[PDB]
CSV table of C-alpha atoms and ligand atoms in Angstrom, one decimal:
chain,number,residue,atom,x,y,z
J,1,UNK,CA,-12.7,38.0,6.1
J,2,UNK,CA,-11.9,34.8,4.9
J,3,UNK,CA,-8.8,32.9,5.1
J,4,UNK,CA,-9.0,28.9,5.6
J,5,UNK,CA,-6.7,26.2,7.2
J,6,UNK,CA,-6.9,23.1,5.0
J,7,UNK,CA,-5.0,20.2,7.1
J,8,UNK,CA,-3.9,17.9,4.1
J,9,UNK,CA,-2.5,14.5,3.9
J,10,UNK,CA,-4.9,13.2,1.5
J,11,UNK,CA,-6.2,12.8,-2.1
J,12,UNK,CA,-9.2,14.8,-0.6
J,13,UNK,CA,-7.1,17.1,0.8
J,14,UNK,CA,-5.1,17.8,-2.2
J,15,UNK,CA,-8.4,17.8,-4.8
J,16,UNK,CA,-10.1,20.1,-1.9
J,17,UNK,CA,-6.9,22.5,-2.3
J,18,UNK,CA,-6.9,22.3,-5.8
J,19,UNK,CA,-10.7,23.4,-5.7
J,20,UNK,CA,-9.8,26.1,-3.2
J,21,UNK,CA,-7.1,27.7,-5.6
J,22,UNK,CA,-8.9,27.7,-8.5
J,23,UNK,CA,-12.2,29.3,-7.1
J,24,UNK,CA,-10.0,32.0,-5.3
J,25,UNK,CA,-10.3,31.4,-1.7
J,26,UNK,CA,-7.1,33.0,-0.1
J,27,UNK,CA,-6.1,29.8,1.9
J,28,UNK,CA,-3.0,27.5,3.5
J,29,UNK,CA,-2.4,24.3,3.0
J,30,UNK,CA,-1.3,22.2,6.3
J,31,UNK,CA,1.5,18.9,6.3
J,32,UNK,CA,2.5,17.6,9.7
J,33,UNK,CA,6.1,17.0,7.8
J,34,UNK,CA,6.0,13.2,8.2
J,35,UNK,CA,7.8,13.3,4.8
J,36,UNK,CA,10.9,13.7,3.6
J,37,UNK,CA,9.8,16.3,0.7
J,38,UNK,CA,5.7,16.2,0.4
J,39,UNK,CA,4.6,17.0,-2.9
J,40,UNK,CA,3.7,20.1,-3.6
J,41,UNK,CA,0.0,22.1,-3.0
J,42,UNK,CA,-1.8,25.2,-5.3
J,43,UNK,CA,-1.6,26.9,-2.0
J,44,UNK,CA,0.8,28.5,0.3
J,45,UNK,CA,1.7,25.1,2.4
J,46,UNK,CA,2.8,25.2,6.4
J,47,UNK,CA,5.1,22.3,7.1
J,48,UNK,CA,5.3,20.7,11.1
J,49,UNK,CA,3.3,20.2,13.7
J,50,UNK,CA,1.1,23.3,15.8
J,51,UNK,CA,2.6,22.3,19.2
J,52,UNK,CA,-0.3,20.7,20.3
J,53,UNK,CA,-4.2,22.3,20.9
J,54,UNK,CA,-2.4,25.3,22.7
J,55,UNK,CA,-0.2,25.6,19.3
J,56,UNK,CA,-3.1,25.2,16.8
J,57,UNK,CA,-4.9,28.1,19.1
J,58,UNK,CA,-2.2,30.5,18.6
J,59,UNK,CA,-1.4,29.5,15.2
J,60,UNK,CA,-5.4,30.3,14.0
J,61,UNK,CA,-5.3,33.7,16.2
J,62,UNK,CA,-2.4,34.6,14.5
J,63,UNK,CA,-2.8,34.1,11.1
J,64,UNK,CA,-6.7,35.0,11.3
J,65,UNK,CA,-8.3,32.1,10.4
J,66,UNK,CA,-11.7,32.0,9.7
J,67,UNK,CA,-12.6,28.5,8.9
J,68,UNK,CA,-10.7,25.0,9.0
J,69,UNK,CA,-11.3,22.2,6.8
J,70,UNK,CA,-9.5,19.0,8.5
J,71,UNK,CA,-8.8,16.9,5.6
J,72,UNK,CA,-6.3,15.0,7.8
J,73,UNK,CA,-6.6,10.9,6.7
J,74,UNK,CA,-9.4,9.5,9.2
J,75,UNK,CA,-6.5,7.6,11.5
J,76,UNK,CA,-4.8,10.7,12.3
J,77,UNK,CA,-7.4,11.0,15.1
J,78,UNK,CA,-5.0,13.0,17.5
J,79,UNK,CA,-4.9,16.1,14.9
J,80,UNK,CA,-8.6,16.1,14.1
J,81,UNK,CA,-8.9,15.8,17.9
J,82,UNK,CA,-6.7,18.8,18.3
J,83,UNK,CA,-8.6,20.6,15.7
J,84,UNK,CA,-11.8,20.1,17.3
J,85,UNK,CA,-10.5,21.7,20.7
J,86,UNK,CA,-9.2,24.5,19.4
J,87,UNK,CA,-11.8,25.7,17.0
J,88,UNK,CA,-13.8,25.0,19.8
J,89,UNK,CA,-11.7,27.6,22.1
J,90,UNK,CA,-11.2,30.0,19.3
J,91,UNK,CA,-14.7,30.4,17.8
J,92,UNK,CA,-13.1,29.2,13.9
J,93,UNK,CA,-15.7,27.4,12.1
J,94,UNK,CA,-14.9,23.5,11.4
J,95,UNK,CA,-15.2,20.8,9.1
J,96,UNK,CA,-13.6,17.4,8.6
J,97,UNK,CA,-13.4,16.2,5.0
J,98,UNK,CA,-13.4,12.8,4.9
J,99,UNK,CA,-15.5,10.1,3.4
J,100,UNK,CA,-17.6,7.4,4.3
J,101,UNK,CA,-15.7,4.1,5.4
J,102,UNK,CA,-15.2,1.8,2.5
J,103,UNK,CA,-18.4,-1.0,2.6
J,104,UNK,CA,-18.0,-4.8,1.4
J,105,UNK,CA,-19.1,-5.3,-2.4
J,106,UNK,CA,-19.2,-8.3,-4.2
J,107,UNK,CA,-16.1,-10.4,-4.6
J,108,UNK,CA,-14.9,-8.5,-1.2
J,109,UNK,CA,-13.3,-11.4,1.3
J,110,UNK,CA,-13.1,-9.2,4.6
J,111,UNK,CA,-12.6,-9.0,7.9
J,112,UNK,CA,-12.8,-6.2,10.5
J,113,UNK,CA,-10.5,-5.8,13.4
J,114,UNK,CA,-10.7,-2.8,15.5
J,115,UNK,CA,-7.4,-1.5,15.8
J,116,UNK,CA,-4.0,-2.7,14.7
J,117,UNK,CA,-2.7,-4.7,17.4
J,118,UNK,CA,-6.3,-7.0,16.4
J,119,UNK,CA,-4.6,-7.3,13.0
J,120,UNK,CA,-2.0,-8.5,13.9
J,121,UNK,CA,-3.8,-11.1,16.3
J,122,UNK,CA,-5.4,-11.5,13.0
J,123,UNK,CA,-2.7,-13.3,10.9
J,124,UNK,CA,-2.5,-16.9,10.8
J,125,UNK,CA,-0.2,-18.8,12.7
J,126,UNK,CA,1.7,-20.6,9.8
J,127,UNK,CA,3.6,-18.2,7.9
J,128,UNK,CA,1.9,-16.4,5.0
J,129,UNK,CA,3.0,-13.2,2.7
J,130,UNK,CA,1.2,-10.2,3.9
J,131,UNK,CA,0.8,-6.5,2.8
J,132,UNK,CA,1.0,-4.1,5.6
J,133,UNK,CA,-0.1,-1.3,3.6
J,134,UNK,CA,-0.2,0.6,6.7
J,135,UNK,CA,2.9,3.0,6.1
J,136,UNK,CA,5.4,3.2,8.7
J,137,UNK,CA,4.9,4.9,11.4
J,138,UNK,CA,3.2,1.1,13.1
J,139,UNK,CA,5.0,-1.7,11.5
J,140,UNK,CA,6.8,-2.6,14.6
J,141,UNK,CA,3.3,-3.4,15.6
J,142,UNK,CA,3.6,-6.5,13.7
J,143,UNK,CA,6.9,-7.3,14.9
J,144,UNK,CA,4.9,-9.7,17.8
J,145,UNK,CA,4.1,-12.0,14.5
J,146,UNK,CA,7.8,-12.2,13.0
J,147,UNK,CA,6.9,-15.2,11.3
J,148,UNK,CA,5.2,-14.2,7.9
J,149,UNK,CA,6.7,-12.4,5.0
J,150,UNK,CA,5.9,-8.7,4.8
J,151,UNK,CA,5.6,-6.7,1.8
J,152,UNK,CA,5.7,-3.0,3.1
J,153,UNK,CA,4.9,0.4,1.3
J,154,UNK,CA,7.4,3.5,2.3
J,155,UNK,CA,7.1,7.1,1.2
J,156,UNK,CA,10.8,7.5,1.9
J,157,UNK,CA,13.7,4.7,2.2
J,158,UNK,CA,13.9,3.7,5.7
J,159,UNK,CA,16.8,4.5,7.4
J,160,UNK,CA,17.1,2.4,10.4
J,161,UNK,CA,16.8,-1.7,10.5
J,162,UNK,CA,13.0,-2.6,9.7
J,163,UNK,CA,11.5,-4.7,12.7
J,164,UNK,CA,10.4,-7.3,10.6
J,165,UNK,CA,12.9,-10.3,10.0
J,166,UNK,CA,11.4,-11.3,6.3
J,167,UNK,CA,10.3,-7.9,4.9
J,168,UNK,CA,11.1,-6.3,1.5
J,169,UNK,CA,10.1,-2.6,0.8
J,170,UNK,CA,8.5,-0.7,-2.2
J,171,UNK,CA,9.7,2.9,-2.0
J,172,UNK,CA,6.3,4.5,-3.7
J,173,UNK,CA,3.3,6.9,-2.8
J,174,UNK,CA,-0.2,7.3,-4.0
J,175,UNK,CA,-2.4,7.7,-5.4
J,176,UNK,CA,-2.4,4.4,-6.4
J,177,UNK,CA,-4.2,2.4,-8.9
J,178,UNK,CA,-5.7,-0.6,-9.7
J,179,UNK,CA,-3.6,-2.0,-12.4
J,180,UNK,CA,-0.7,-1.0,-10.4
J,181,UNK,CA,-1.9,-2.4,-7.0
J,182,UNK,CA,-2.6,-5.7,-8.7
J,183,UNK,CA,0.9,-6.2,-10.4
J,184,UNK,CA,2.2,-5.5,-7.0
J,185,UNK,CA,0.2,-8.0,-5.3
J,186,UNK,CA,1.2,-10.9,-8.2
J,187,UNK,CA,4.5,-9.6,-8.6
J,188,UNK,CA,5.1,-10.9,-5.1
J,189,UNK,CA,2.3,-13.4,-4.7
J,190,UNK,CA,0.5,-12.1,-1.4
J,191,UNK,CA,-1.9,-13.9,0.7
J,192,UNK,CA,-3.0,-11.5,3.0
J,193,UNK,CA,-3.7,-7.6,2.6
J,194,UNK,CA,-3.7,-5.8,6.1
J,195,UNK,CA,-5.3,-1.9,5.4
J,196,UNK,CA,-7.0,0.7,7.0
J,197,UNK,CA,-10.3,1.7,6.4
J,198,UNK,CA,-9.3,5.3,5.4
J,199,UNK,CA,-12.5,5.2,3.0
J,200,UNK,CA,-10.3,7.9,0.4
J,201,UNK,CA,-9.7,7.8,-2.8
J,202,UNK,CA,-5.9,7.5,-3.4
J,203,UNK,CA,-5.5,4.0,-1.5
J,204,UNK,CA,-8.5,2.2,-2.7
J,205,UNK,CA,-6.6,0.6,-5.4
J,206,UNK,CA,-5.1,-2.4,-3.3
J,207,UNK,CA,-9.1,-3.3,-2.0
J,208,UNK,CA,-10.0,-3.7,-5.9
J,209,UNK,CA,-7.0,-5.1,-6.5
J,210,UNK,CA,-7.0,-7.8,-3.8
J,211,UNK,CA,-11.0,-8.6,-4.7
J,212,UNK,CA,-9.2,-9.2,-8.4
J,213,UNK,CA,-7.1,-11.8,-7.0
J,214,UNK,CA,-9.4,-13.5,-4.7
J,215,UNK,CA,-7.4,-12.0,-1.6
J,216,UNK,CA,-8.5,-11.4,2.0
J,217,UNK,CA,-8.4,-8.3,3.3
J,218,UNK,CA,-8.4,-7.8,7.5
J,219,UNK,CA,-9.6,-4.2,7.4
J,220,UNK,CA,-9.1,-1.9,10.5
J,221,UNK,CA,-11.9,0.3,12.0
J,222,UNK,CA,-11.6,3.6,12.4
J,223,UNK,CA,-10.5,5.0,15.6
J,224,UNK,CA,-12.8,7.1,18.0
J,225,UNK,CA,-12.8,11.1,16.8
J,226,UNK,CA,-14.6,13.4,19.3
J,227,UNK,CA,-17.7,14.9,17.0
J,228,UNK,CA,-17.5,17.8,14.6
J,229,UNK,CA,-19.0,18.9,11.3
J,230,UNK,CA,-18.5,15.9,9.0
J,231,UNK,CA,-18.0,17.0,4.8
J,232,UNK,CA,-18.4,13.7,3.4
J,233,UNK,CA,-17.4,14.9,-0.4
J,234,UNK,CA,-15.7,17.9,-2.1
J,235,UNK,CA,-19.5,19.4,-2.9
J,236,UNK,CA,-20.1,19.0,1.0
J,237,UNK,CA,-17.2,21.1,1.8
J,238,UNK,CA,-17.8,23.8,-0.8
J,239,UNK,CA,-21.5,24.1,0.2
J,240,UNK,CA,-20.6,24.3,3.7
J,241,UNK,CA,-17.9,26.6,3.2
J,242,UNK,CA,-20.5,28.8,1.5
J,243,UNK,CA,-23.0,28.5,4.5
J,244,UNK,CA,-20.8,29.3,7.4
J,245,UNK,CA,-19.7,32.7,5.3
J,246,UNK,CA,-16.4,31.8,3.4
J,247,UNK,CA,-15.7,33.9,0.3
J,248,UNK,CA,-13.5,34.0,-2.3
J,249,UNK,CA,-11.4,36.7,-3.2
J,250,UNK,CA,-13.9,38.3,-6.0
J,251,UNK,CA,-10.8,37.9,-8.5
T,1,LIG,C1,-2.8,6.3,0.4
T,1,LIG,C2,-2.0,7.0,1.2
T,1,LIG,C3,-1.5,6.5,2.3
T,1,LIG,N1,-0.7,7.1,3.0
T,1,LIG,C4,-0.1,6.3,4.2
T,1,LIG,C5,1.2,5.9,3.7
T,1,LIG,C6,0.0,7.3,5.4
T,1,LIG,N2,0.5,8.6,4.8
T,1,LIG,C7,1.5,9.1,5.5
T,1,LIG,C8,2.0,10.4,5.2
T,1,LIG,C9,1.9,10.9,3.9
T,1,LIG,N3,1.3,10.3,2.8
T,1,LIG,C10,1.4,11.2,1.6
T,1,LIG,C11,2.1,10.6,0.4
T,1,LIG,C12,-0.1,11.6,1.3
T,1,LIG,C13,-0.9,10.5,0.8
T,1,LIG,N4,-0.8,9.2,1.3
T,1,LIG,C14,-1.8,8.4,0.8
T,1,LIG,C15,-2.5,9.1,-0.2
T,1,LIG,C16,-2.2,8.6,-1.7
T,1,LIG,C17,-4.1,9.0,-0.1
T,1,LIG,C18,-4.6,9.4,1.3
T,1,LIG,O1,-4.0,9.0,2.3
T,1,LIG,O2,-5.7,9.9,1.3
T,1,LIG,C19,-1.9,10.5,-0.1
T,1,LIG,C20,-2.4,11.8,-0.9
T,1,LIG,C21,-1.5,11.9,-2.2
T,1,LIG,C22,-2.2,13.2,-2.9
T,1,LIG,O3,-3.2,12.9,-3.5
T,1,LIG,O4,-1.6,14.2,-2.8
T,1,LIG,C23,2.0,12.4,2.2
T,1,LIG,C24,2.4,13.6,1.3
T,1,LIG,C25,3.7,13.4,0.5
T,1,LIG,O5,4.7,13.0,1.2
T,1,LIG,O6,3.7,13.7,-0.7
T,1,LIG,C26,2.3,12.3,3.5
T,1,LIG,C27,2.8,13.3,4.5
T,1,LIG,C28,1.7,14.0,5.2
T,1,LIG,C29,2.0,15.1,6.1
T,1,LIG,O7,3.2,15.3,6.4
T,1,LIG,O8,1.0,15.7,6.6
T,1,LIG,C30,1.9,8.3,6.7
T,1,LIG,C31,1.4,9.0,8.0
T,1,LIG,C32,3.4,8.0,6.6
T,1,LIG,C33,3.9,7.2,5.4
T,1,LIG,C34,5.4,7.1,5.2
T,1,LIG,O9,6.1,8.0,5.8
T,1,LIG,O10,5.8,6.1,4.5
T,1,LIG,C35,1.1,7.0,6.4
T,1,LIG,C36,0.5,6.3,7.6
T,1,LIG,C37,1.3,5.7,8.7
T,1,LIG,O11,2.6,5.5,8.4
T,1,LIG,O12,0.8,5.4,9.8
T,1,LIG,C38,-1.2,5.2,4.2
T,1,LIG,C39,-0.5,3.8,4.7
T,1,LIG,C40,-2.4,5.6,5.1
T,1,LIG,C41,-3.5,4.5,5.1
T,1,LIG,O13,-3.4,3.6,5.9
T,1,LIG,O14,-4.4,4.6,4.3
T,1,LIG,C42,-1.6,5.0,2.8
T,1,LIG,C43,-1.1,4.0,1.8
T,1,LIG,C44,-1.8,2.7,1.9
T,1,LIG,C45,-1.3,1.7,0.7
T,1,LIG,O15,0.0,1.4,0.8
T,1,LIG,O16,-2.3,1.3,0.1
T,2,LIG,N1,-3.0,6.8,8.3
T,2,LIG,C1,-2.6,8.1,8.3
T,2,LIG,O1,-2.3,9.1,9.1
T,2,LIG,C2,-2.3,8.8,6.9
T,2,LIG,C3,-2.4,8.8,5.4
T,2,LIG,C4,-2.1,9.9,4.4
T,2,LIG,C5,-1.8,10.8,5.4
T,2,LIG,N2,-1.7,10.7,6.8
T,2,LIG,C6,-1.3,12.1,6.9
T,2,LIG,O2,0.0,12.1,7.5
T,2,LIG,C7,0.0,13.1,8.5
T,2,LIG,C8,0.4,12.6,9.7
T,2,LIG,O3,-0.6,11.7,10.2
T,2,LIG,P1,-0.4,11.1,11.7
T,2,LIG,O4,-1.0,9.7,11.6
T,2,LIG,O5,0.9,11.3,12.2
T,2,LIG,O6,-1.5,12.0,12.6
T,2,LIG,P2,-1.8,12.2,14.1
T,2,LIG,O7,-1.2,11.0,15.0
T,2,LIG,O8,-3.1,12.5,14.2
T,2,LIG,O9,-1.0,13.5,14.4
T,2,LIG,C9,0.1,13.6,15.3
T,2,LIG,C10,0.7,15.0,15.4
T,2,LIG,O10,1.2,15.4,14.1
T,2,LIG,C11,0.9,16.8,13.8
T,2,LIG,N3,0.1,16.8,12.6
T,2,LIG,C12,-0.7,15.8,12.1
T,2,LIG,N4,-1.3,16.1,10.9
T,2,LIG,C13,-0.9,17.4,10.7
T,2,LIG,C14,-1.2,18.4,9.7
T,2,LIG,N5,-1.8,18.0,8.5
T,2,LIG,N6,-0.6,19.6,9.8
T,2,LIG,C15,0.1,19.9,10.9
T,2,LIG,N7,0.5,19.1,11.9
T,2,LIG,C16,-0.1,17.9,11.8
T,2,LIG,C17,0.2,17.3,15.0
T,2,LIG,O11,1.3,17.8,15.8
T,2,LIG,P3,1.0,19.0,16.9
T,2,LIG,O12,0.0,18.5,18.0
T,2,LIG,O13,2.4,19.3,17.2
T,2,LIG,O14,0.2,20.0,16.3
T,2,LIG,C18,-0.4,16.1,15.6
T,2,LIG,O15,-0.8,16.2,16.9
T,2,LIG,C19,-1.3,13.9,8.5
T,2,LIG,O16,-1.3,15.1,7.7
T,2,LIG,C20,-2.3,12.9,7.9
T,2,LIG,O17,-3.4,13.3,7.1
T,2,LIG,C21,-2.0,9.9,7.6
């Protein structure tokens, strides 16, 4: 019988668990606790890391899971790696949620670096005002180009001194939106938008955003995953879900 692992951190995640609870599926929700207090889930929600592939492996025996869906965002590559080795050992049944990357439109300015220390190779040497909306955990990255001014995007205040020596904070998570991704960007006059390509839903705001103002993006591919059952949308996951043998409860 069925009980699934959904590794969040997403809007995909959190629409998948949404889904989940309201179709009956007796399920847990997965943070890796990089927050101080994540919002909440519909579903019973584990907090912290597994301790490693050997950690996930005990973790899936004991709780008798059946099935994972790793909804984890596309550059947390060392948990969907971990997932991969130890459904593998285990025999659970996997799939990663996640979309296709985001693809240039019209209007779009971008360029593609592929990794973070590129983007930062990226910048230009006179100083410009650049959104690293990156997060935290790799803005000291861009500490080896001190010279701009950064604009940075925090889930929690920081505690410690930033690594950046002209940097102001927003204190803010997604999803975000358009209208409110473009005041941000006017409000303080950016040149230069430094992203991911996570390809999700609840950060595509600041790519519409920046195409509204004429702004370049340097986007950063994503990094290498080792391969597994790719759900590219919320009916992918449900119809796979359904085809490997995962049942609701009947309620
Ligand atoms: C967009 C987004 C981002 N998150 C970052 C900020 C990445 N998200 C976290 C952790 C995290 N984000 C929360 C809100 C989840 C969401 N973040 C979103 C979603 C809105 C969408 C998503 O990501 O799909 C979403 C889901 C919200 C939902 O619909 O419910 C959350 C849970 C909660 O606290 O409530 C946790 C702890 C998760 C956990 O413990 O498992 C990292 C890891 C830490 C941020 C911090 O501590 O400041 C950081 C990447 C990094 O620093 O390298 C970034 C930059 C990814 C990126 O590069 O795209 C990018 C923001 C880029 C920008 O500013 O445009
Ligand atoms: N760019 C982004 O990562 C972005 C955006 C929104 C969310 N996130 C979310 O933020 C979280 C942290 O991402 P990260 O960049 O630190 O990933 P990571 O580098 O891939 O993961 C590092 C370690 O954190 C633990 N971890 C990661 N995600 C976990 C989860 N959902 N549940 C339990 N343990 C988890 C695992 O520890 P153990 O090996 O000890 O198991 C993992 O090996 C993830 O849930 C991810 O989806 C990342």
């Amino acid at each position: 019988m069925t009980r699934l692992l959904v590794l969040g951190g997403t809007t995909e995640a959190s629409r998948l668990a949404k889904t989940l609870a309201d179709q009956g599926f007796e399920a847990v929700f997965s943070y890796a606790g990089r927050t101080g207090a994540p919002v909440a889930q519909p579903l019973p929600t584990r907090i912290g890391g597994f301790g490693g592939v050997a950690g996930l492996v005990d973790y899936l025996t004991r709780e008798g899971v059946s099935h994972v869906i790793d909804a984890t965002h596309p550059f947390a590559a060392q948990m969907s790696a971990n997932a991969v080795a130890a459904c593998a050992q285990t025999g659970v049944a996997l799939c990663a949620f996640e979309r296709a990357p985001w693809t240039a439109q019209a209007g779009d300015r971008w360029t593609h670096v592929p990794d973070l220390a590129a983007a930062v190779a990226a910048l230009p040497q006179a100083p410009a005002r650049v959104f690293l909306a990156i997060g935290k955990q790799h803005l000291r990255d861009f500490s080896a180009a001190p010279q701009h001014h950064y604009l940075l995007r925090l889930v929690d205040p920081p505690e410690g001194p930033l690594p950046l020596p002209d940097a102001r904070a927003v204190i803010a998570r997604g999803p975000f939106t358009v209208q409110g991704d473009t005041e941000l960007l006017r409000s303080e006059t950016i040149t230069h938008v430094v992203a991911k390509n996570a390809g999700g839903a609840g950060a595509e705001a600041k790519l519409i955003a920046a195409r509204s103002l004429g702004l370049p993006v340097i986007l950063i591919d994503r990094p290498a995953v080792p391969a597994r059952d790719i759900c590219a949308t919320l009916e992918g996951v449900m119809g796979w879900l359904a085809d490997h043998g995962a049942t609701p409860r009947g309620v």
